[PDB]
Amino acid sequence: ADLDNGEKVFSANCAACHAGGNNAIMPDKTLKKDVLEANSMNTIDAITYQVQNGKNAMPAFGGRLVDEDIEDAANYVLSQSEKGW
Ligand code: HEC
């Protein structure tokens, strides 16, 4: 399952800084619905690019994660965001 796979990817790669949809480094850049909309990060392309390319203290995962995992993770974040985390 892509959403099921996205969760596995999230756990092994994203929870270190975003467990529960938060942001352990920059408290304002969370994965919550309203913040994601405010930052224009609520679409699949925008999130997959940020994951692939990284940004500031967030690492780039293009090298390490295969394209499918980056997508499934993006979708996982979006669904969780809409369910409230
Ligand atoms: C800590 C070492 C991080 C890891 C591992 C991941 N992310 Fe991250 N993310 C982190 C920071 C410090 C920031 C803010 C970057 C900046 O300078 O603005 C982010 C941001 C995001 C966002 C955008 C959130 C928003 O705009 O409110 C997303 C969608 C995001 N991060 C996703 C994400 C995913 C899915 C990860 C696993 C592949 C991931 N991040 C890991 C820090 C860290």
Coordinates of C-alpha atoms and ligand atoms in Angstrom, one line a residue:
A1 CA 0.0 0.0 0.0
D2 CA 1.5 3.4 -1.0
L3 CA 0.0 5.1 2.1
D4 CA 1.1 2.2 4.1
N5 CA 4.5 2.4 2.5
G6 CA 4.5 6.1 2.9
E7 CA 4.1 5.7 6.6
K8 CA 7.1 3.3 6.8
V9 CA 9.2 5.8 4.9
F10 CA 8.0 8.6 7.1
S11 CA 8.9 6.6 10.2
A12 CA 12.4 5.7 9.1
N13 CA 13.2 9.0 7.5
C14 CA 11.1 11.9 8.8
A15 CA 10.1 11.1 12.4
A16 CA 13.5 12.3 13.6
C17 CA 12.3 15.8 13.0
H18 CA 8.5 15.7 12.3
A19 CA 7.1 12.9 14.5
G20 CA 3.4 13.8 15.1
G21 CA 3.5 16.4 12.3
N22 CA 5.7 18.8 14.3
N23 CA 9.1 20.4 13.6
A24 CA 11.7 19.8 16.2
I25 CA 14.1 22.4 14.9
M26 CA 11.9 25.3 13.6
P27 CA 8.6 25.1 15.5
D28 CA 6.8 27.2 12.9
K29 CA 7.4 24.9 10.0
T30 CA 5.2 22.1 11.0
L31 CA 3.2 19.5 9.0
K32 CA -0.2 20.8 10.2
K33 CA -2.9 21.6 7.6
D34 CA -3.1 25.3 8.1
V35 CA 0.7 25.8 8.1
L36 CA 1.1 23.7 5.1
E37 CA -1.6 25.8 3.3
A38 CA 0.0 29.0 4.5
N39 CA 3.4 27.9 3.1
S40 CA 2.0 26.6 -0.2
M41 CA 3.2 23.2 0.7
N42 CA -0.1 21.4 0.4
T43 CA 0.2 19.9 -3.0
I44 CA 2.0 16.7 -4.0
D45 CA 4.6 18.4 -6.3
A46 CA 5.7 21.0 -3.8
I47 CA 6.2 18.4 -1.1
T48 CA 7.9 15.8 -3.3
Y49 CA 10.3 18.5 -4.5
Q50 CA 11.2 19.7 -0.9
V51 CA 11.8 16.1 0.1
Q52 CA 13.9 15.4 -3.0
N53 CA 15.9 18.6 -2.7
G54 CA 16.0 19.4 1.0
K55 CA 15.9 22.9 2.4
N56 CA 18.2 24.5 4.9
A57 CA 18.5 22.1 8.0
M58 CA 16.2 19.6 6.3
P59 CA 18.2 17.0 4.3
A60 CA 17.7 16.2 0.6
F61 CA 16.5 12.6 0.1
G62 CA 16.7 12.4 -3.7
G63 CA 19.8 10.4 -3.5
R64 CA 18.7 8.0 -0.9
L65 CA 15.0 7.5 -1.3
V66 CA 13.7 5.9 -4.5
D67 CA 11.2 8.0 -6.3
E68 CA 8.2 5.9 -5.2
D69 CA 9.0 6.2 -1.6
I70 CA 9.3 10.0 -1.8
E71 CA 5.8 10.1 -3.4
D72 CA 4.2 7.7 -0.9
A73 CA 5.7 9.8 1.9
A74 CA 4.3 13.0 0.4
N75 CA 0.9 11.5 0.3
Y76 CA 1.2 10.1 3.8
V77 CA 2.0 13.6 5.0
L78 CA -1.0 15.1 3.2
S79 CA -3.5 12.5 4.5
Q80 CA -2.3 12.8 8.0
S81 CA -2.4 16.5 7.8
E82 CA -6.0 16.4 6.8
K83 CA -6.8 13.9 9.6
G84 CA -5.1 16.1 12.1
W85 CA -2.1 13.9 13.0
Ligands
HEC1 C1 15.4 17.2 10.4 C2 16.8 16.8 10.3 C3 14.5 17.0 9.3 C4 14.2 15.8 8.6 C5 14.9 14.4 8.8 C6 13.2 16.0 7.7 N1 12.8 17.4 7.8 FE1 11.2 18.2 6.8 N2 11.8 20.0 7.5 C7 12.8 20.3 8.5 C8 13.1 21.7 8.6 C9 14.1 22.3 9.5 C10 12.2 22.3 7.8 C11 12.0 23.8 7.6 C12 13.0 24.2 6.5 C13 13.0 25.7 6.2 O1 14.1 26.3 6.3 O2 11.9 26.3 6.0 C14 11.4 21.3 7.2 C15 10.2 21.5 6.4 C16 9.4 20.4 5.9 C17 8.1 20.7 5.2 C18 7.4 22.0 5.0 C19 6.6 22.4 6.3 C20 6.1 23.8 6.2 O3 6.3 24.5 5.3 O4 5.4 24.2 7.2 C21 7.7 19.4 4.8 C22 6.5 19.1 3.9 C23 8.7 18.5 5.3 N3 9.7 19.1 6.0 C24 8.6 17.1 5.0 C25 9.6 16.2 5.4 C26 9.5 14.8 5.1 C27 8.3 14.1 4.4 C28 10.6 14.2 5.5 C29 11.0 12.8 5.4 C30 11.4 12.4 3.9 C31 11.4 15.3 6.2 N4 10.7 16.5 6.1 C32 12.5 15.1 7.0 C33 13.6 19.3 9.0 C34 13.6 17.9 8.7

